[PDB]
Amino acid sequence: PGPVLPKNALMQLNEIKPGLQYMLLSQTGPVHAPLFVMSVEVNGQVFEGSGPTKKKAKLHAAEKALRSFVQFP
What we know:
Helix content: 25-40%
Number of strands: 3
Strand content: 25-35%
Radius of gyration: 12 Å
Shape: globular
CATH topology: Double Stranded RNA Binding Domain
Order of helices and strands: HEEEH
CATH class: Alpha Beta
């Protein structure tokens, strides 16, 4: 489904695997930007992606999770 989750990536993996499990590992950053990391779990393994917002962190994670799983890297 979509577009109500960070459109292109989230829709890509929501279709491909409508059953991922996202965890937020902690908000920090370079003092002039926040930075969040999400680990997203796709099959038995968690895939980690970093974003200056938790919604971009999970996008990064989930984007790679399915991309890596379909093609590599």
